[PDB]
Paper text:
extracellular pH, and works in conjunction with a cognate inner membrane antiporter. excreted by the antiporter in exchange for a new amino acid substrate. that it is a decamer made of two pentameric rings. central pore, with the CTDs at the periphery.
(cryoEM) and combined it with the crystal structures of the individual proteins. and the C-terminal β-sheet of LdcI23. 7.5 Å to 6.2 Å resolution. interacted with LdcI but was not capable of binding to LdcC. whole upon enzyme activation by pH and the binding of LARA. to the incorporation of the LdcI decamer into the LdcI-RavA cage. decameric state upon activation and incorporation into the LdcI-RavA cage.
Residue numbers in the entry:
A (entry chain A), B (entry chain A): 1 to 366, 368 to 711
C (entry chain A): 1 to 178
Amino acid sequence: MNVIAILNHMGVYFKEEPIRELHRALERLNFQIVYPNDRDDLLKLIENNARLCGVIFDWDKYNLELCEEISKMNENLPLYAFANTYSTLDVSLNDLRLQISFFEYALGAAEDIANKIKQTTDEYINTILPPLTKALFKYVREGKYTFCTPGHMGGTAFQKSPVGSLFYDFFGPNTMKSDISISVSELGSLLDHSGPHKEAEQYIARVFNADRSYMVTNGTSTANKIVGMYSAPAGSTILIDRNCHKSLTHLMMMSDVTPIYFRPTRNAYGILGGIPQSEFQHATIAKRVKETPNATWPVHAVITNSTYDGLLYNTDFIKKTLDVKSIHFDSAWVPYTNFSPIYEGKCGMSGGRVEGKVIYETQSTHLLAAFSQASMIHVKGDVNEETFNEAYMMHTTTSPHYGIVASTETAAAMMKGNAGKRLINGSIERAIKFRKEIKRLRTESDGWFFDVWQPDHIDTTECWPLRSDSTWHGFKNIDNEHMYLDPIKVTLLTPGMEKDGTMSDFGIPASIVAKYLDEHGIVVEKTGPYNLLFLFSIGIDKTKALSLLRALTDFKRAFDLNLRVKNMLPSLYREDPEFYENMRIQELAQNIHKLIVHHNLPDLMYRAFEVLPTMVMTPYAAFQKELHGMTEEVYLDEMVGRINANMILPYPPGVPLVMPGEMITEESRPVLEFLQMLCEIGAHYPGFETDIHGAYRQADGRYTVKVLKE
Amino acid sequence: MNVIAILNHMGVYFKEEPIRELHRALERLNFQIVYPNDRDDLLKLIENNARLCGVIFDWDKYNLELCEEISKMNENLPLYAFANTYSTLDVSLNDLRLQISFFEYALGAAEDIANKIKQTTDEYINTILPPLTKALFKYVREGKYTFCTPGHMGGTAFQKSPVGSLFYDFFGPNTMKSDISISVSELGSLLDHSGPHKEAEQYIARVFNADRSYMVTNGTSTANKIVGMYSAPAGSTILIDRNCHKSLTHLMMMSDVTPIYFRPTRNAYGILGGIPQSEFQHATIAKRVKETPNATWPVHAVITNSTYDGLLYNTDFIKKTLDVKSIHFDSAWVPYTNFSPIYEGKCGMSGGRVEGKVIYETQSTHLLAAFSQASMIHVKGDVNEETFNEAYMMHTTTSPHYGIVASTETAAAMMKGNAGKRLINGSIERAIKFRKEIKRLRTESDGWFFDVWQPDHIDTTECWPLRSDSTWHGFKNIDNEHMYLDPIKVTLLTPGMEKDGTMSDFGIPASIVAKYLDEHGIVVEKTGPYNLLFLFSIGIDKTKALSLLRALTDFKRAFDLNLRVKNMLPSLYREDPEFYENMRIQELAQNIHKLIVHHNLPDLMYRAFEVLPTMVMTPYAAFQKELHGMTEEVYLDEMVGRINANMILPYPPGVPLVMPGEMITEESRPVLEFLQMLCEIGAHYPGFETDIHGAYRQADGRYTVKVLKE
Amino acid sequence: MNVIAILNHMGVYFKEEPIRELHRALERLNFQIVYPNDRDDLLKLIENNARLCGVIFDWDKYNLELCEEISKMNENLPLYAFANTYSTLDVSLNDLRLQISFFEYALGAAEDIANKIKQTTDEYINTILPPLTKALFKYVREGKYTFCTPGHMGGTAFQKSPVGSLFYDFFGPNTMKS
């Protein structure tokens, strides 16, 4: 932070010479002076460079031309205004709130003015930096504790070791010294929620519109279990989205609870739809309580809001309708709802308390930018603070990393205020630009191209509603004014399926487009049989957009030339030279596509997940048997009529198929048929193997599963 | 890594000029040349500087004088030997294993020789560096994934933000880029234990003498729960050291188990003694099974080996004697046992398997040097790998930090081989030196001084045995050839108690010595009423030893002058100027000491922990009530006859006093008397407050505790 | 292969200063910068000089005036395009097949951008060179076979002989080692 811009020649020595003296005095005080070519260049420098930290200018020549323009960009930026004859305090200025220091052009003033500017900059720096990190830097500068642990002693031991020097040499002293313990007692305490730790909680709780906010450093995996174990008593029944995370299965195995499942809808594509309004209404729930063996009224519900594909609930309706005392919105996908008005009435925290209920959001901070494992628990309502805090303290890491904690606090510091508001606004604007760019290239090229899966026109900047009277989304009998498409989540479609969900004769499975992009280091966020997703973050610049956009036109060009796999996919070639020697990219695509077409994969996959295996015992009940080691393996073929010991998690489509305690019967035979079909279709091409978790491929090529012993 | 030493003038141009040409050629290839004044300076440079990475010398002038000396220090260090007339392959060399490249002094050779040396150094570097970190650096150099998350995009977002720049500016690009996800698929997988992750496990498992080793990144807190939940079935009885960690209480509350406690011995000082041999013998355990309500034969035992004060068990005796199928040595204090022969027969992993039993060590790597939260599970025996691995995967962080994992791997890299063996040997040697230094200063000074708590003579370098025929240790009727003192753990004694455990008229409580050292930034590892501990690590150098040694003589000097608290403890003074205005350091000491003497604190503390509160219900049973919110607060005075809801953990002495479900009665009245006494003695001086966890100081100054409702 | 052409003054510090920083950063990375007097001089340089291996330009000032003209001469030639306000992905570009990397004018970017350009140039070089000659050069750089024949040992014997040095001195190590 040392670049000072100067903008001018004035035509008079009495002005020019003091600025020369000040230039020189400031350079001696370790400032880099930069000189925008013109007024517009200066505004672009500021706009793009946060390291520009002051502007010197002639008051008369520039004040009415600059002051408001700069204040729009950054209201703390130091301005050093030099006066002429007519320079003064005009009544027009009286009403503006500006951060202004007035200075004259004089030789020999730089020493004192520089010292004041230094002090005033430190004052501004001190205001904007968060206090815990500020104190940490001060310790690293001043403190003198020797004869101390950690044994590495500020990384010292790493430097005398070539092997340790590799790790130290990269990270360096500061990184090594920031790994501190409670021996630095003046930073307060996380466990007492005291000092700069309280200041952080209030800052966050106020920013994110929560009653109370906890900082969790082991992800939403851990936030779920802290909320779960406090929330789900033994012997109780819970309503749980059949679309649930594994960490909630691990909770069920550890707690004696009976699940009744909210039942999402699904369309032919396999895209999950929302739990319909009926699922929340007292009459519907009461009926399932009647139909579920040993069920009682639910004590805790967990809803995933939004769905992945951007269907958000009318949360005003849910909070009013769902008659459950404890409602936990796992809102991992929507951490940003407080920051766009388009999400009002469509998020957990929106509005005020819900009388008679505690509402949770658990959020995976790491659709924002933060270190992996950073998660928040946002509580809207009361807990038993002593029992909740004991629950928190029992599940706290053994050695908390002092950076991870600061990384989550500094992630907010970055996104804070205007400039973070303007950053996200910019990304929304470019999202819509890119959307229209795909349409352009679709026009310009002869023959097949990518398309976008979206409404016919997007004349409106919002999360576009999905309506029952529209066909573009492919869902059947959708609720209206219920689901909305987030502009920044861009799905692309590859050739292979019809707008119906029926199959084309010509197809290019998306997995092949991924292999190509993988040779070129470009990662596809998410891929399905014929779909690819791209996220337009604040990362994504003009260089990356051009490289991606160009890479996509290069795929088409290379595909259409029918390049040899040998030439287009050299790393794949090296896996089996003979297998791949003569194959061309279009033949690889044809063969895999023909398999998909023939094996009717989408229909079989759809049907496997539309019925439920039979719950013979609960996951917890089966785990009691496992706890005593009462498990054997059987072959996959032999599994009908047996009680499964493990979750069986196949890829595709990546969601649980059989739970511990469930059994395939005749009612649920399509389950087994899908599984056997996956083993067959995936046995053909090296690099395109079957993948089913919970099934064990024996060295002989047969699959086993774990079952309960009799 | 670029410093090359040259050692010589030879008196002939045909030798000197090529070395000039090579000096210049090497400087142009970015080597720093250094010139030891003499042969001894070179050996000291090598000994102290790992960045010296090559030595050029005249073969004849130096080979018989240098080769073996350097090979003793570092057997990979590149040597570049220049030949004369008599230089050749003498039969005497045939048997030595050396890393030698032979070169001639010639102009113009540096370009090619430098390139070979560069390549040969990279080959050596590549051998010594561990492969996962090596691959990570290569990615950071070569890879080109754009349009990607993490959103911060290699820290890019931090740089445009003064607040984020504070965090980035300190850590920098490399630190920011090493926070990666499984998108970098070529590093293998932790969860599959595959690729460079397997290579790490084998490396560690072989180094630490285990059958199998797991890498845990959430401390031994988490290692305990992974082993616990696999090991302790519901309805079973467990033998557990009444000296247990809180994380094992949190396990008991979560699992339906019945505890029977191994009962340590204790002496008047309050120092824990070992569970006697009788506690392991079948007849003793059988008798407690009879006497314990609803007890069955134990399925799992947890012993803390060693004790803190260095009493190690004959583990050969325990493994042979203790008739329990599952024995878990929580060996957090003894991570280094594999590396000194003095610990043979005295650690969990020593020797081979124990037929018919699984033996665990859980170790807190962070008495070594590693990041906080680093812990290992070392298994000696078989587990059900699928159920154990499912247990591991359920308790794995949400977002693993990729550095923490490398920090534990690089901590081993540092300590590896000879140089890490010589480092620890050096620390043992200095420990004994310092021990004799305290004795010297004790002689030189008139009047009182510090003493060391150790045997009368230490003519032997080992862990000295504590014997029943010796009085120095203060324990009553100790087992012989049972406990040993680790030389590197140095306890110092302050005036105040007699060698009996009886009280002196003159005392200086250790807490006051801590306040002094705290003003000077010096931390005391561990303090008790009249004791202070110092660890002589590989960190501790001559500068730190002198500063500590001098700081200790300065305390005496300043104490004996009776400086004003105002002058000697200015920060304490600022807390209450009026309170402290006229008080001198000796008066502060007197008043606090007189309190200790009068309140007979050691006797009362000793007695509070020698009886056990009555277990009315188990901690788990009480938690069922808490699970339903059935808790109220009562005042401390009102607690006899009530069932405690929380653990009550007082400081001092820092170990549990009452468990959930326990009740103070008449049998255990000294418990309440100690607690009330602590509230009284600690109410006198600002900065010397009472501290009891589980008791809540109300704003009015009264204490409450949580109890079960009736 | 190290001559990079720069074609411009733009009249604004926010553009000119990053290009100054990049000029200097690139010169430190061992590039020779050349400056065509004008657009036509640049096209003649390219047309006549295969050692010109990259062009840096302002996207708006020059893209519609240069892109097609350069693509007619050499379709692998690295272009480093710097963006302004109106710079973006216009539907008109969607159909052209071009080798384009997009970059911004920024101080301190040269170290990373230079490394990417170096890598991208090596990728282009590696595509165009035939693989046997490529492998031969790699051996001459890395391999370490000593105690070997040919007896001349990479021409070594020629250098100690004035008569043999006449033949070696002219051809040199590379010719002798191939």
